[PDB]
PDB file of all heavy atoms in Angstrom:
ATOM      1  N   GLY A  98      55.045 -48.702  -4.257  1.00  0.00           N
ATOM      2  CA  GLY A  98      53.740 -49.260  -3.732  1.00  0.00           C
ATOM      3  C   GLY A  98      53.454 -50.426  -4.747  1.00  0.00           C
ATOM      4  O   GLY A  98      52.592 -50.243  -5.556  1.00  0.00           O
ATOM      5  N   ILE A  99      54.005 -51.599  -4.638  1.00  0.00           N
ATOM      6  CA  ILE A  99      53.830 -52.721  -5.386  1.00  0.00           C
ATOM      7  C   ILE A  99      53.388 -52.403  -6.831  1.00  0.00           C
ATOM      8  O   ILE A  99      54.205 -51.810  -7.630  1.00  0.00           O
ATOM      9  CB  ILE A  99      52.776 -53.643  -4.638  1.00  0.00           C
ATOM     10  CG1 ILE A  99      51.628 -52.817  -4.106  1.00  0.00           C
ATOM     11  CG2 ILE A  99      53.464 -54.258  -3.387  1.00  0.00           C
ATOM     12  CD1 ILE A  99      50.698 -53.570  -3.218  1.00  0.00           C
ATOM     13  N   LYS A 100      52.213 -52.781  -7.248  1.00  0.00           N
ATOM     14  CA  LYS A 100      51.618 -52.692  -8.564  1.00  0.00           C
ATOM     15  C   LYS A 100      50.243 -51.995  -8.918  1.00  0.00           C
ATOM     16  O   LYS A 100      49.136 -52.646  -8.475  1.00  0.00           O
ATOM     17  CB  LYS A 100      51.670 -54.002  -9.279  1.00  0.00           C
ATOM     18  CG  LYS A 100      52.996 -54.460  -9.711  1.00  0.00           C
ATOM     19  CD  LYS A 100      52.999 -55.663 -10.534  1.00  0.00           C
ATOM     20  CE  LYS A 100      54.258 -56.100 -11.430  1.00  0.00           C
ATOM     21  NZ  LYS A 100      54.484 -54.997 -12.425  1.00  0.00           N
ATOM     22  N   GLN A 101      50.143 -50.879  -9.648  1.00  0.00           N
ATOM     23  CA  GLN A 101      48.923 -50.195  -9.957  1.00  0.00           C
ATOM     24  C   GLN A 101      48.926 -49.281 -11.299  1.00  0.00           C
ATOM     25  O   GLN A 101      49.879 -49.091 -11.894  1.00  0.00           O
ATOM     26  CB  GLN A 101      48.371 -49.410  -8.735  1.00  0.00           C
ATOM     27  CG  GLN A 101      47.913 -50.149  -7.432  1.00  0.00           C
ATOM     28  CD  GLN A 101      48.979 -50.327  -6.398  1.00  0.00           C
ATOM     29  OE1 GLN A 101      49.798 -49.489  -6.136  1.00  0.00           O
ATOM     30  NE2 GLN A 101      48.967 -51.532  -5.774  1.00  0.00           N
ATOM     31  N   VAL A 102      47.735 -48.776 -11.567  1.00  0.00           N
ATOM     32  CA  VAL A 102      47.453 -47.919 -12.694  1.00  0.00           C
ATOM     33  C   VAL A 102      46.356 -46.679 -12.635  1.00  0.00           C
ATOM     34  O   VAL A 102      45.324 -46.957 -12.157  1.00  0.00           O
ATOM     35  CB  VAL A 102      47.087 -48.619 -14.072  1.00  0.00           C
ATOM     36  CG1 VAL A 102      48.236 -49.510 -14.605  1.00  0.00           C
ATOM     37  CG2 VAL A 102      45.881 -49.486 -13.721  1.00  0.00           C
ATOM     38  N   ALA A 103      46.888 -45.535 -12.977  1.00  0.00           N
ATOM     39  CA  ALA A 103      46.010 -44.293 -12.941  1.00  0.00           C
ATOM     40  C   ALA A 103      46.673 -43.165 -13.535  1.00  0.00           C
ATOM     41  O   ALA A 103      47.482 -43.363 -14.495  1.00  0.00           O
ATOM     42  CB  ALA A 103      45.725 -43.961 -11.520  1.00  0.00           C
ATOM     43  N   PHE A 104      46.435 -41.960 -13.175  1.00  0.00           N
ATOM     44  CA  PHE A 104      46.923 -40.786 -13.764  1.00  0.00           C
ATOM     45  C   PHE A 104      47.284 -39.535 -12.737  1.00  0.00           C
ATOM     46  O   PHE A 104      47.794 -39.776 -11.725  1.00  0.00           O
ATOM     47  CB  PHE A 104      45.953 -40.323 -14.896  1.00  0.00           C
ATOM     48  CG  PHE A 104      46.506 -38.945 -15.629  1.00  0.00           C
ATOM     49  CD1 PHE A 104      47.667 -38.912 -16.234  1.00  0.00           C
ATOM     50  CD2 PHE A 104      45.598 -37.846 -15.685  1.00  0.00           C
ATOM     51  CE1 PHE A 104      48.127 -37.777 -16.804  1.00  0.00           C
ATOM     52  CE2 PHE A 104      46.047 -36.752 -16.307  1.00  0.00           C
ATOM     53  CZ  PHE A 104      47.235 -36.653 -16.946  1.00  0.00           C
ATOM     54  N   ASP A 105      47.058 -38.190 -13.180  1.00  0.00           N
ATOM     55  CA  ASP A 105      47.432 -37.226 -12.228  1.00  0.00           C
ATOM     56  C   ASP A 105      46.825 -35.759 -12.495  1.00  0.00           C
ATOM     57  O   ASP A 105      46.031 -35.672 -13.411  1.00  0.00           O
ATOM     58  CB  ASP A 105      48.973 -37.136 -12.085  1.00  0.00           C
ATOM     59  CG  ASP A 105      49.458 -35.861 -12.880  1.00  0.00           C
ATOM     60  OD1 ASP A 105      49.007 -35.634 -14.084  1.00  0.00           O
ATOM     61  OD2 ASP A 105      50.337 -35.179 -12.428  1.00  0.00           O
ATOM     62  N   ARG A 106      47.395 -34.838 -11.807  1.00  0.00           N
ATOM     63  CA  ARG A 106      47.027 -33.370 -11.802  1.00  0.00           C
ATOM     64  C   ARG A 106      47.758 -32.685 -12.900  1.00  0.00           C
ATOM     65  O   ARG A 106      47.578 -32.969 -14.033  1.00  0.00           O
ATOM     66  CB  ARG A 106      47.267 -32.814 -10.459  1.00  0.00           C
ATOM     67  CG  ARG A 106      47.251 -31.234 -10.356  1.00  0.00           C
ATOM     68  CD  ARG A 106      46.207 -30.639 -11.009  1.00  0.00           C
ATOM     69  NE  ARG A 106      46.652 -29.316 -11.484  1.00  0.00           N
ATOM     70  CZ  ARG A 106      47.019 -28.326 -10.758  1.00  0.00           C
ATOM     71  NH1 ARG A 106      46.955 -28.468  -9.316  1.00  0.00           N
ATOM     72  NH2 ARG A 106      47.350 -27.085 -11.272  1.00  0.00           N
ATOM     73  N   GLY A 107      48.507 -31.604 -12.503  1.00  0.00           N
ATOM     74  CA  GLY A 107      49.274 -30.846 -13.528  1.00  0.00           C
ATOM     75  C   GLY A 107      48.870 -29.412 -13.522  1.00  0.00           C
ATOM     76  O   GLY A 107      47.721 -28.962 -13.650  1.00  0.00           O
ATOM     77  N   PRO A 108      49.912 -28.365 -13.371  1.00  0.00           N
ATOM     78  CA  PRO A 108      49.402 -27.037 -13.309  1.00  0.00           C
ATOM     79  C   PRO A 108      49.218 -26.546 -14.699  1.00  0.00           C
ATOM     80  O   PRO A 108      48.983 -25.417 -14.981  1.00  0.00           O
ATOM     81  CB  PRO A 108      50.221 -26.290 -12.428  1.00  0.00           C
ATOM     82  CG  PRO A 108      51.603 -26.918 -12.731  1.00  0.00           C
ATOM     83  CD  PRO A 108      51.213 -28.407 -12.701  1.00  0.00           C
ATOM     84  N   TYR A 109      49.463 -27.410 -15.698  1.00  0.00           N
ATOM     85  CA  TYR A 109      49.560 -27.080 -17.115  1.00  0.00           C
ATOM     86  C   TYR A 109      49.771 -28.272 -18.001  1.00  0.00           C
ATOM     87  O   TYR A 109      49.976 -29.446 -17.677  1.00  0.00           O
ATOM     88  CB  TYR A 109      50.647 -25.960 -17.407  1.00  0.00           C
ATOM     89  CG  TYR A 109      50.825 -25.725 -18.906  1.00  0.00           C
ATOM     90  CD1 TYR A 109      49.708 -24.965 -19.453  1.00  0.00           C
ATOM     91  CD2 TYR A 109      51.823 -26.088 -19.529  1.00  0.00           C
ATOM     92  CE1 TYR A 109      49.765 -24.726 -20.838  1.00  0.00           C
ATOM     93  CE2 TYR A 109      51.957 -25.796 -20.889  1.00  0.00           C
ATOM     94  CZ  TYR A 109      50.956 -25.192 -21.576  1.00  0.00           C
ATOM     95  OH  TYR A 109      50.969 -25.020 -22.900  1.00  0.00           O
ATOM     96  N   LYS A 110      49.692 -27.888 -19.351  1.00  0.00           N
ATOM     97  CA  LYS A 110      49.832 -28.797 -20.368  1.00  0.00           C
ATOM     98  C   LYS A 110      51.225 -29.483 -20.350  1.00  0.00           C
ATOM     99  O   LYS A 110      52.094 -29.047 -19.614  1.00  0.00           O
ATOM    100  CB  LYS A 110      49.726 -28.060 -21.813  1.00  0.00           C
ATOM    101  CG  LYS A 110      50.686 -28.542 -22.894  1.00  0.00           C
ATOM    102  CD  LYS A 110      50.768 -27.539 -24.056  1.00  0.00           C
ATOM    103  CE  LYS A 110      51.720 -28.088 -25.196  1.00  0.00           C
ATOM    104  NZ  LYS A 110      51.740 -27.165 -26.308  1.00  0.00           N
ATOM    105  N   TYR A 111      51.350 -30.559 -21.059  1.00  0.00           N
ATOM    106  CA  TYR A 111      52.569 -31.374 -21.172  1.00  0.00           C
ATOM    107  C   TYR A 111      53.448 -31.064 -22.188  1.00  0.00           C
ATOM    108  O   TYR A 111      53.421 -31.654 -23.346  1.00  0.00           O
ATOM    109  CB  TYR A 111      52.227 -32.912 -21.030  1.00  0.00           C
ATOM    110  CG  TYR A 111      50.934 -33.145 -20.171  1.00  0.00           C
ATOM    111  CD1 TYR A 111      49.710 -32.490 -20.384  1.00  0.00           C
ATOM    112  CD2 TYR A 111      51.035 -34.062 -19.157  1.00  0.00           C
ATOM    113  CE1 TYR A 111      48.612 -32.644 -19.539  1.00  0.00           C
ATOM    114  CE2 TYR A 111      49.977 -34.228 -18.226  1.00  0.00           C
ATOM    115  CZ  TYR A 111      48.730 -33.529 -18.449  1.00  0.00           C
ATOM    116  OH  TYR A 111      47.626 -33.668 -17.615  1.00  0.00           O
ATOM    117  N   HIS A 112      54.472 -30.158 -22.103  1.00  0.00           N
ATOM    118  CA  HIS A 112      55.327 -29.718 -23.210  1.00  0.00           C
ATOM    119  C   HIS A 112      56.681 -29.241 -22.401  1.00  0.00           C
ATOM    120  O   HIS A 112      57.809 -29.516 -22.893  1.00  0.00           O
ATOM    121  CB  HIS A 112      54.914 -28.485 -23.845  1.00  0.00           C
ATOM    122  CG  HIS A 112      55.189 -27.182 -23.061  1.00  0.00           C
ATOM    123  ND1 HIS A 112      54.836 -27.124 -21.782  1.00  0.00           N
ATOM    124  CD2 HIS A 112      56.111 -26.224 -23.374  1.00  0.00           C
ATOM    125  CE1 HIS A 112      55.438 -25.997 -21.127  1.00  0.00           C
ATOM    126  NE2 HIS A 112      56.192 -25.599 -22.100  1.00  0.00           N
ATOM    127  N   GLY A 113      56.513 -28.753 -21.078  1.00  0.00           N
ATOM    128  CA  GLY A 113      57.635 -28.344 -20.442  1.00  0.00           C
ATOM    129  C   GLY A 113      57.650 -29.010 -18.999  1.00  0.00           C
ATOM    130  O   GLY A 113      57.284 -30.109 -18.920  1.00  0.00           O
ATOM    131  N   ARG A 114      58.079 -28.352 -17.992  1.00  0.00           N
ATOM    132  CA  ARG A 114      58.120 -28.906 -16.596  1.00  0.00           C
ATOM    133  C   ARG A 114      57.142 -30.091 -16.501  1.00  0.00           C
ATOM    134  O   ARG A 114      57.500 -31.108 -16.168  1.00  0.00           O
ATOM    135  CB  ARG A 114      57.610 -27.815 -15.709  1.00  0.00           C
ATOM    136  CG  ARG A 114      58.675 -27.168 -14.930  1.00  0.00           C
ATOM    137  CD  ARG A 114      59.394 -28.120 -14.044  1.00  0.00           C
ATOM    138  NE  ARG A 114      60.796 -27.851 -13.931  1.00  0.00           N
ATOM    139  CZ  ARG A 114      61.187 -26.594 -13.531  1.00  0.00           C
ATOM    140  NH1 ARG A 114      60.382 -25.620 -13.220  1.00  0.00           N
ATOM    141  NH2 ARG A 114      62.455 -26.343 -13.307  1.00  0.00           N
ATOM    142  N   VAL A 115      55.822 -29.751 -16.804  1.00  0.00           N
ATOM    143  CA  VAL A 115      54.847 -30.782 -16.758  1.00  0.00           C
ATOM    144  C   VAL A 115      54.942 -31.922 -17.860  1.00  0.00           C
ATOM    145  O   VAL A 115      54.734 -33.006 -17.494  1.00  0.00           O
ATOM    146  CB  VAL A 115      53.469 -30.125 -16.724  1.00  0.00           C
ATOM    147  CG1 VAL A 115      53.420 -28.877 -17.470  1.00  0.00           C
ATOM    148  CG2 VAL A 115      52.274 -31.115 -17.294  1.00  0.00           C
ATOM    149  N   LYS A 116      55.250 -31.595 -19.024  1.00  0.00           N
ATOM    150  CA  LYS A 116      55.403 -32.625 -20.085  1.00  0.00           C
ATOM    151  C   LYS A 116      56.404 -33.532 -19.504  1.00  0.00           C
ATOM    152  O   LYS A 116      56.267 -34.773 -19.480  1.00  0.00           O
ATOM    153  CB  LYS A 116      56.018 -32.144 -21.377  1.00  0.00           C
ATOM    154  CG  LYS A 116      55.865 -33.179 -22.537  1.00  0.00           C
ATOM    155  CD  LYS A 116      56.317 -32.661 -23.894  1.00  0.00           C
ATOM    156  CE  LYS A 116      56.489 -33.784 -24.795  1.00  0.00           C
ATOM    157  NZ  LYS A 116      55.153 -34.595 -25.072  1.00  0.00           N
ATOM    158  N   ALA A 117      57.412 -32.967 -18.824  1.00  0.00           N
ATOM    159  CA  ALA A 117      58.441 -33.634 -18.085  1.00  0.00           C
ATOM    160  C   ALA A 117      57.897 -34.566 -17.027  1.00  0.00           C
ATOM    161  O   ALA A 117      58.013 -35.873 -17.316  1.00  0.00           O
ATOM    162  CB  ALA A 117      59.456 -32.513 -17.607  1.00  0.00           C
ATOM    163  N   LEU A 118      57.431 -34.051 -15.960  1.00  0.00           N
ATOM    164  CA  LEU A 118      56.830 -35.013 -14.881  1.00  0.00           C
ATOM    165  C   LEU A 118      56.188 -36.186 -15.523  1.00  0.00           C
ATOM    166  O   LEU A 118      56.106 -37.173 -15.144  1.00  0.00           O
ATOM    167  CB  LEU A 118      55.891 -34.261 -13.896  1.00  0.00           C
ATOM    168  CG  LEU A 118      55.509 -35.035 -12.583  1.00  0.00           C
ATOM    169  CD1 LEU A 118      54.518 -36.211 -13.007  1.00  0.00           C
ATOM    170  CD2 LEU A 118      56.705 -35.638 -11.881  1.00  0.00           C
ATOM    171  N   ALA A 119      55.499 -35.822 -16.721  1.00  0.00           N
ATOM    172  CA  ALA A 119      54.868 -36.722 -17.468  1.00  0.00           C
ATOM    173  C   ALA A 119      55.791 -37.760 -17.799  1.00  0.00           C
ATOM    174  O   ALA A 119      55.909 -38.892 -17.193  1.00  0.00           O
ATOM    175  CB  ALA A 119      54.332 -36.200 -18.697  1.00  0.00           C
ATOM    176  N   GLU A 120      56.713 -37.563 -18.793  1.00  0.00           N
ATOM    177  CA  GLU A 120      57.662 -38.744 -19.174  1.00  0.00           C
ATOM    178  C   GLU A 120      58.286 -39.348 -17.992  1.00  0.00           C
ATOM    179  O   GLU A 120      58.592 -40.618 -18.089  1.00  0.00           O
ATOM    180  CB  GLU A 120      58.869 -38.221 -20.076  1.00  0.00           C
ATOM    181  CG  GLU A 120      58.252 -37.459 -21.331  1.00  0.00           C
ATOM    182  CD  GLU A 120      57.987 -36.075 -20.986  1.00  0.00           C
ATOM    183  OE1 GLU A 120      58.378 -35.577 -19.929  1.00  0.00           O
ATOM    184  OE2 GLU A 120      57.279 -35.492 -21.878  1.00  0.00           O
ATOM    185  N   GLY A 121      58.490 -38.635 -16.909  1.00  0.00           N
ATOM    186  CA  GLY A 121      59.198 -39.346 -15.752  1.00  0.00           C
ATOM    187  C   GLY A 121      58.146 -40.427 -15.378  1.00  0.00           C
ATOM    188  O   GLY A 121      58.575 -41.559 -15.429  1.00  0.00           O
ATOM    189  N   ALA A 122      56.942 -40.133 -15.140  1.00  0.00           N
ATOM    190  CA  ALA A 122      56.028 -41.063 -14.705  1.00  0.00           C
ATOM    191  C   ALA A 122      56.043 -42.130 -15.833  1.00  0.00           C
ATOM    192  O   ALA A 122      56.192 -43.225 -15.542  1.00  0.00           O
ATOM    193  CB  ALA A 122      54.563 -40.338 -14.761  1.00  0.00           C
ATOM    194  N   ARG A 123      56.004 -41.607 -17.117  1.00  0.00           N
ATOM    195  CA  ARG A 123      56.061 -42.447 -18.290  1.00  0.00           C
ATOM    196  C   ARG A 123      56.947 -43.610 -18.258  1.00  0.00           C
ATOM    197  O   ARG A 123      56.450 -44.755 -18.386  1.00  0.00           O
ATOM    198  CB  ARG A 123      56.416 -41.465 -19.501  1.00  0.00           C
ATOM    199  CG  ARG A 123      56.583 -42.112 -20.807  1.00  0.00           C
ATOM    200  CD  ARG A 123      57.994 -42.423 -21.114  1.00  0.00           C
ATOM    201  NE  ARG A 123      58.036 -43.557 -22.086  1.00  0.00           N
ATOM    202  CZ  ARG A 123      57.496 -44.783 -21.909  1.00  0.00           C
ATOM    203  NH1 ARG A 123      56.850 -45.009 -20.777  1.00  0.00           N
ATOM    204  NH2 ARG A 123      57.563 -45.652 -22.883  1.00  0.00           N
ATOM    205  N   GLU A 124      58.223 -43.337 -17.863  1.00  0.00           N
ATOM    206  CA  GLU A 124      59.121 -44.426 -17.647  1.00  0.00           C
ATOM    207  C   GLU A 124      58.561 -45.235 -16.367  1.00  0.00           C
ATOM    208  O   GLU A 124      58.395 -46.540 -16.446  1.00  0.00           O
ATOM    209  CB  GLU A 124      60.557 -44.079 -17.403  1.00  0.00           C
ATOM    210  CG  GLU A 124      61.115 -42.907 -18.355  1.00  0.00           C
ATOM    211  CD  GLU A 124      60.629 -43.066 -19.723  1.00  0.00           C
ATOM    212  OE1 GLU A 124      60.682 -44.183 -20.344  1.00  0.00           O
ATOM    213  OE2 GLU A 124      60.383 -41.992 -20.453  1.00  0.00           O
ATOM    214  N   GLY A 125      58.229 -44.516 -15.412  1.00  0.00           N
ATOM    215  CA  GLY A 125      57.715 -45.189 -14.111  1.00  0.00           C
ATOM    216  C   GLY A 125      56.814 -46.258 -14.427  1.00  0.00           C
ATOM    217  O   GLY A 125      56.875 -47.310 -13.736  1.00  0.00           O
ATOM    218  N   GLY A 126      55.991 -46.214 -15.323  1.00  0.00           N
ATOM    219  CA  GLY A 126      55.042 -47.325 -15.764  1.00  0.00           C
ATOM    220  C   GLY A 126      55.800 -48.226 -16.792  1.00  0.00           C
ATOM    221  O   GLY A 126      55.864 -49.464 -16.757  1.00  0.00           O
ATOM    222  N   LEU A 127      56.296 -47.561 -17.910  1.00  0.00           N
ATOM    223  CA  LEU A 127      56.993 -48.330 -18.966  1.00  0.00           C
ATOM    224  C   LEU A 127      57.942 -49.427 -18.472  1.00  0.00           C
ATOM    225  O   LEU A 127      58.005 -50.420 -19.264  1.00  0.00           O
ATOM    226  CB  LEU A 127      57.760 -47.295 -19.789  1.00  0.00           C
ATOM    227  CG  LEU A 127      58.301 -48.068 -21.140  1.00  0.00           C
ATOM    228  CD1 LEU A 127      57.224 -48.535 -22.105  1.00  0.00           C
ATOM    229  CD2 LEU A 127      59.340 -47.120 -21.661  1.00  0.00           C
ATOM    230  N   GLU A 128      58.717 -49.189 -17.496  1.00  0.00           N
ATOM    231  CA  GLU A 128      59.680 -50.051 -16.884  1.00  0.00           C
ATOM    232  C   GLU A 128      60.880 -50.897 -17.708  1.00  0.00           C
ATOM    233  O   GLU A 128      61.010 -52.036 -17.530  1.00  0.00           O
ATOM    234  CB  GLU A 128      58.949 -51.218 -16.088  1.00  0.00           C
ATOM    235  CG  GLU A 128      57.879 -50.680 -15.084  1.00  0.00           C
ATOM    236  CD  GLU A 128      58.548 -50.398 -13.654  1.00  0.00           C
ATOM    237  OE1 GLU A 128      58.940 -51.317 -13.011  1.00  0.00           O
ATOM    238  OE2 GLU A 128      58.550 -49.076 -13.265  1.00  0.00           O
ATOM    239  N   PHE A 129      61.338 -49.932 -18.613  1.00  0.00           N
ATOM    240  CA  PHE A 129      62.428 -50.667 -19.492  1.00  0.00           C
ATOM    241  C   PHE A 129      63.630 -49.849 -19.522  1.00  0.00           C
ATOM    242  O   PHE A 129      64.668 -50.437 -19.854  1.00  0.00           O
ATOM    243  CB  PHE A 129      61.824 -51.082 -20.934  1.00  0.00           C
ATOM    244  CG  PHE A 129      62.248 -49.979 -22.029  1.00  0.00           C
ATOM    245  CD1 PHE A 129      62.423 -50.325 -23.352  1.00  0.00           C
ATOM    246  CD2 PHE A 129      62.094 -48.501 -21.783  1.00  0.00           C
ATOM    247  CE1 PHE A 129      62.727 -49.465 -24.308  1.00  0.00           C
ATOM    248  CE2 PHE A 129      62.315 -47.593 -22.701  1.00  0.00           C
ATOM    249  CZ  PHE A 129      62.580 -48.106 -24.037  1.00  0.00           C
TER     250      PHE A 129
END
Side-chain angles (χ1 to χ4, degrees):
Chain A
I99 48 190
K100 286 187 163 292
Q101 292 96 36
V102 289
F104 182 51
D105 108 312
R106 165 46 211 295
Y109 177 68
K110 142 190 176 178
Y111 319 58
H112 83 303
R114 261 295 154 50
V115 29
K116 193 173 169 60
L118 188 289
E120 306 80 17
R123 180 265 156 298
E124 317 319 321
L127 185 71
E128 307 274 296
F129 100 144

